[PDB]
Amino acid sequence: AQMRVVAFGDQTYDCSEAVSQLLRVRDDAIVVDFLERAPAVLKAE
Amino acid sequence: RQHSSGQEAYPTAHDSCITGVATGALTAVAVGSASSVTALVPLALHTV
Amino acid sequence: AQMRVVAFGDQTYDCSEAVSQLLRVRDDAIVVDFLERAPAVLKAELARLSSEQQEETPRFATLAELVPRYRAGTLNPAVSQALTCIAQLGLFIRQHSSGQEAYPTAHDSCITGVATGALTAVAVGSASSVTALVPLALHTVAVAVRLGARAWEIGSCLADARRGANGRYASWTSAVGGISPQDLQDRISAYTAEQALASVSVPYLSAAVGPGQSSVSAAPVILDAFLSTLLRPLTTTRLPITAPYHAPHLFTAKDVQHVTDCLPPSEAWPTVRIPIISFSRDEAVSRGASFPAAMSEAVRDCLIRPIALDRMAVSIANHARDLGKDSVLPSPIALSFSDKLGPQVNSHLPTSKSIPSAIGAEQQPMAKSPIAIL
Amino acid sequence: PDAQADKDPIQASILGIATNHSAEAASITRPHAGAQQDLFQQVLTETGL
Amino acid sequence: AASGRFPQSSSMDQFWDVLINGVDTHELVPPTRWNAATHVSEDPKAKNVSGTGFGCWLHEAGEFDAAYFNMSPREAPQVDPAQRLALLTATEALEQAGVVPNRTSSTQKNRVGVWYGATSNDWMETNSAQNVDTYFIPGGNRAFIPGRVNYFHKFSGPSYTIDTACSSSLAALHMACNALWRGEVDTAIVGGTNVLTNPDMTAGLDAGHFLSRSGNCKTFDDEADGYCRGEAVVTLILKRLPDAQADKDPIQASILGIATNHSAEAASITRPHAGAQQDLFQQVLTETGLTANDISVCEMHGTGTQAGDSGETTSVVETLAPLNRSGSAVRTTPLYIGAVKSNVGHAESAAGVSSLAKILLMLKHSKIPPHVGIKTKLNHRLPDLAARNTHIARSEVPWPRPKNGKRRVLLNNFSAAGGNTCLVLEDAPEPEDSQEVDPREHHIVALSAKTPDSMVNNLTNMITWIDKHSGDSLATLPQLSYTTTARRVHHRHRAVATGTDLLQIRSSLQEQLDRRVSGERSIPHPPNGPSFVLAFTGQGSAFAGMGVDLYKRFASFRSDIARYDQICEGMSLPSIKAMFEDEKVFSTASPTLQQLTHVCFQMALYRLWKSLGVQAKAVVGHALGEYA
Amino acid sequence: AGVVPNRTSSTQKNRVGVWYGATSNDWMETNSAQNVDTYFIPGGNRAFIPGRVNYFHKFSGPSYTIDTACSSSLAALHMACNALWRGEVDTAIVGGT
Amino acid sequence: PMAFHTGQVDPILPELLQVAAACSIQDPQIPVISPAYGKVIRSAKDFQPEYFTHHCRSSVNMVDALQSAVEEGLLDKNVIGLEIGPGPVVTQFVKEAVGTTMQTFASINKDKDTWQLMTQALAKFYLAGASVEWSRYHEDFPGAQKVLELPAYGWALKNYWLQYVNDWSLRKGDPAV
Amino acid sequence: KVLELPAYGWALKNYWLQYVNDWSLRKGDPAV
Amino acid sequence: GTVWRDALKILSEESSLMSLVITSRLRDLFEEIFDLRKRFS
């Protein structure tokens, strides 16, 4: 009866490599869709 | 990506919990408020 | 304590308006990504075929140029089959991403389908998300075209194209009314005995609809000859089924195996988590089967077993009772005469608003959208 | 989305558009009606009406 | 596949010869285009006179087969060489690639789109303009460059011409990738043309200080005064990888991503600057998902300009060869940078595809050719390439492919119209398992033409070619067999030869050639759609193992036989499939089995010949043969 | 259209494209051809039709000229619509000359 | 073993008539030279069930059918014959009917190979001008169909050119002087 | 809201290179 | 027979654009050689 905990970090973790790897996602369209709307709504705000 | 391309099952209150520090808190709210990746995405953009 | 049923249709439903209103979809990226993608897995399995399919293969630039040749009847069973399947998946993928509608789960919902819908049904039952449905859904596109393609192989073999066709493809199926399926079966047997016809060329009862309704399939020359013997008060109406289906004498297990050869072997195939109501069998409910096995079984429903649409309603209701649900929502997708389904299922048994979102979110995304001229 | 977001004027909206080529023509000079009709229904599908 | 015509090159292979031998093809304008004595002056003073005459010229650009593309001798001249050559190269590429009309589903009518870049229509300005006639706009307008390719081959898909000036063809490649990723098309035909007959193009370029009055493009040379004229025509065949692997088509390489921006921040309308270029390079790296180390070679848009070369080089090294803050190279492997323009000149519209073509041969032969653009000394504006492990190969360097790995390349094609476009390329997928010999022992070679003279020519050329390649490999005859038969667009008059090996093919073609040379007049044998009557025999002459080769080799035939067998078994008839699989059964086999085997054999055989488009004027059959 | 570059997200300079159809440049064939000079080629090639627009307003997005002959402009419109459809540009400038 | 087209096949004709009666008959798309009737049939009226019993029992009249064909102009020396079947038995009869110079060959025979007869035949056939889709004939071997690169096809080219002459470009804008 | 207002008032001048002496009819001919 | 002789040359120089040109030159075939020659009489 193991329980998984989903833990997110703060600014201290370097997300440059992360996002660099997320712009590589192609297999599933929701990731490129999310990364498409995110900067647009971002700059809109 | 982990829960759609990675085909990892979505967290459930029974078998799992969420946590976050600073930014992670906001994102944690978003994952804690959906049943599915599809239902997570709008709350995801709200969180952005 | 309500249970929604997702019911898919067959070739009879005209998907021209369906496909039309699908490429209108600008409200989600996975719809246009999937719909645009469909030709890719499709064409990846369009090339392994016989020569005659390469003869009369129509041109289609996208999923759009098939529509006029569909209405005109000049579209083959392989592509028209794949087109109906694409339309069904597109409407679903729409409704559950564009439409902000939650994905089916085993607790509150079941799936059902008729012929093409059975293939569609396997795909929806096997995924945990729309995004996870996308690849399986394409694998199903390839299965659909190979299904219609093999049906056209054997059907072309039985009878070739007529001289007065002018590119229009004749319907192998017709709907009969005013007689019980058993009584009509007796009339078929009698016609068989009295007329000289082969064992493969015989007419057969393709579907059982209702107490006085059913559907019979034979050759346009043969079917015409048989239907000419049925006189009023009985009714006869045409349907767009352009290849022989549901014929255990024409097809065997090897044909099913072959249609599904486009699915590579692997151990990671997801199983069917949502129960699918397969009403045309001994086992009314099937869950947990692997996606390839489920697909081959659905292909067998299409090719081998007859449709028993008189058993569909009660089949849904039985499962609704099994989970202790008072009533059902119908959620039909491209289903002929869908409006009357809901009452029929609820007869065996004893409210919506849009969700607003962020400013600019409730509308369509910023990827695809009906471009405004400023 | 961007148009309405920026409160831009909108005189109309393009649903869709499509292109094919008249390959079945007799001559290089005259486009023929078969391809054109298939293209009209092509945009009526892509647009959805 | 890719086919093209470049300076001193009638094929991709002779362009490899240009590159690997360090050939420099620039020369004074030949008299066929325009007279240098009157049009060129050391110091131009008179109007429409230029300071340079030099270019790299396709001396065979006028050569065209009017009978192959359905053209009359009066119409063919008035067609631009860009149109004619585009038709030739596009055809050849279809023969080298996986596309034939009515073959697989990737070859259908509208699923095949065409895009071509073109920056100059001089033919209509200069040559056909002396006497205008009906086929002036039919032969001069650029839209017909892709158009004619759609009409002849009956490709109904989209048709476009792109003009971004010197970036045009790579821009058209961008459009093509966007359509292949929209679903509009799957087969895509991409090319570019730049054949020029006007001296004004030259004089205007020189007036703008674009062209170099010394020589060719000198990329990276300390004294670099401009680019130089160059001429090329290319067509390629492109497909999404899933469909390409579905058909087992040949794949020379795979394009991962391509992007386009514009240099808006420029202080002028002429020179593209470095900021936009770098932002583009990193954009494509992030998009395609690769680090600097993954790219080992970069084909630059080198125009042999001090400003252009230094600017672009800085953008390339700062992307692909960054330097540590301490001053050590971030690169673990070497970068080799080059420019094709130093050899075959600046093809302008066709420059992009020319560069890509260079890569396809570099990939094939596993070598990096020498860089001849440096005449005297390296440019002093360039950053220190050696500290960053960037290199300009002066002589050829081994370029082997890592085991279970793919090297990837960055290509650049930019324009004085300031658009900037580049792609990331990758080696083709490894085979499924390994090589295998064709189990077919005997092969068939098909030759065609629309004229007897052309026929004689094709026969002779084929014989000489066989004499050249006769002993290289055993796989030459199976490849050329399946290729000549399927991959070709044949016409009425047509010749055939068979054999186990290339020698028998030669002996056959030589025999037919002798019949053509001696005892054959100049008129053709009847071109009526040469009436066939098909004769079907009775079961008398049937024998054991009859048509086993047809049953083992031909799939359509196997489909028909297997189908007929199941049709028989469902009707309470004996199984005929065994007669073709095993021969021994013929001894004890019953009359019904013999008879059904014969008639199935004839129906299948008839369908086979009909699959070859044999139009039967009538049929006759003798006893049992009539049933077929 | 009230477009001010870099005012909003959709009007940012790098999200703006240009596409124009053109059947021929008769200017450099006939008019400037009588006397060729330095601005002959800048003034005559079709690619500068969209280019010049990008340079003046400092739009760093794509620049293209399309020639399908008498369908050129709608072909350019099609490419532009595709760019907005795939997210390549926020705003598209479409025209014909 | 038996003797066809003789009195031997008399008892099978009634049942054979019923076999023919269960069929579906259409007008021929191309003419049928019928040895049963020694005549050229263009209509479905002649293919009725009686045809197949008549055929089985009646003699095979090649000479009357062929001679009937040539008199109509359907056959002549320019026409191509093609043997679909084992051995060239029937082509020799057509050849003897129309003329000695008609090109007629076969493909599958026990003496020569398939490919030998095929090149001698297919050469002359396609030399006469026929059309093909070679794809349908070779689109085969789902695993052995590997395609590699080869040079281009041999071209028979002629120079089509309009020579720029008189250097008129330098005189642009000037009058005739 | 965006009102439709007059376009920018342009300071316009005619910039033109006259085609003269009908030299296009004599293409291919010598000077004479 | 004179016009039979001339018409063949009018064909050889051209051979639906071309067809309309051929018949226009007759006065001054894609839809409507022996069919032509007999269509004269």
UniProtKB/Swiss-Prot annotation, chain B:
Induction: Expression is positively regulated by the cercosporin cluster-specific transcription factor CTB8. Expression is also affected by nitrogen and carbon sources and pH, and is also controlled by another transcription activator, CRG1, previously shown to regulate cercosporin production and resistance. It comes from the Eukaryota. Disruption phenotype: Abolishes the production of cercosporin. Does not display any pigmentation. Leads to fewer necrotic lesions on inoculated tobacco leaves compared with the wild type. Multidomain protein; including a starter unit:ACP transacylase (SAT) that selects the starter unit; a ketosynthase (KS) that catalyzes repeated decarboxylative condensation to elongate the polyketide backbone; a malonyl-CoA:ACP transacylase (MAT) that selects and transfers the extender unit malonyl-CoA; a product template (PT) domain that controls the immediate cyclization regioselectivity of the reactive polyketide backbone; 2 acyl-carrier protein (ACP) domains that serve as the tether of the growing and completed polyketide via its phosphopantetheinyl arm; and a C-terminal thioesterase (TE) domain that facilitates the release of the final product from the enzyme. This is Non-reducing polyketide synthase CTB1. It comes from Cercospora nicotianae (Barn spot disease fungus). The chain holds residues 98 to 145 of 2196 of the full protein.
UniProtKB/Swiss-Prot annotation, chain F:
Induction: Expression is positively regulated by the cercosporin cluster-specific transcription factor CTB8. Expression is also affected by nitrogen and carbon sources and pH, and is also controlled by another transcription activator, CRG1, previously shown to regulate cercosporin production and resistance. The active site is at 70 (for beta-ketoacyl synthase activity). Disruption phenotype: Abolishes the production of cercosporin. Does not display any pigmentation. Leads to fewer necrotic lesions on inoculated tobacco leaves compared with the wild type. Multidomain protein; including a starter unit:ACP transacylase (SAT) that selects the starter unit; a ketosynthase (KS) that catalyzes repeated decarboxylative condensation to elongate the polyketide backbone; a malonyl-CoA:ACP transacylase (MAT) that selects and transfers the extender unit malonyl-CoA; a product template (PT) domain that controls the immediate cyclization regioselectivity of the reactive polyketide backbone; 2 acyl-carrier protein (ACP) domains that serve as the tether of the growing and completed polyketide via its phosphopantetheinyl arm; and a C-terminal thioesterase (TE) domain that facilitates the release of the final product from the enzyme. This is Non-reducing polyketide synthase CTB1. It comes from Cercospora nicotianae. The lineage of its organism: Eukaryota, Fungi, Dikarya, Ascomycota, Pezizomycotina. The gene is CTB1. The chain holds residues 484 to 580 of 2196 of the full protein.
Swiss-Prot record, chain H:
Disruption phenotype: Abolishes the production of cercosporin. Does not display any pigmentation. Leads to fewer necrotic lesions on inoculated tobacco leaves compared with the wild type. Induction: Expression is positively regulated by the cercosporin cluster-specific transcription factor CTB8. Expression is also affected by nitrogen and carbon sources and pH, and is also controlled by another transcription activator, CRG1, previously shown to regulate cercosporin production and resistance. Multidomain protein; including a starter unit:ACP transacylase (SAT) that selects the starter unit; a ketosynthase (KS) that catalyzes repeated decarboxylative condensation to elongate the polyketide backbone; a malonyl-CoA:ACP transacylase (MAT) that selects and transfers the extender unit malonyl-CoA; a product template (PT) domain that controls the immediate cyclization regioselectivity of the reactive polyketide backbone; 2 acyl-carrier protein (ACP) domains that serve as the tether of the growing and completed polyketide via its phosphopantetheinyl arm; and a C-terminal thioesterase (TE) domain that facilitates the release of the final product from the enzyme. Polyketide synthase; part of the gene cluster that mediates the biosynthesis of cercosporin, a light-activated, non-host-selective toxin. The perylenequinone chromophore of cercosporin absorbs light energy to attain an electronically-activated triplet state and produces active oxygen species such as the hydroxyl radical, superoxide, hydrogen peroxide or singlet oxygen upon reaction with oxygen molecules. These reactive oxygen species cause damage to various cellular components including lipids, proteins and nucleic acids.
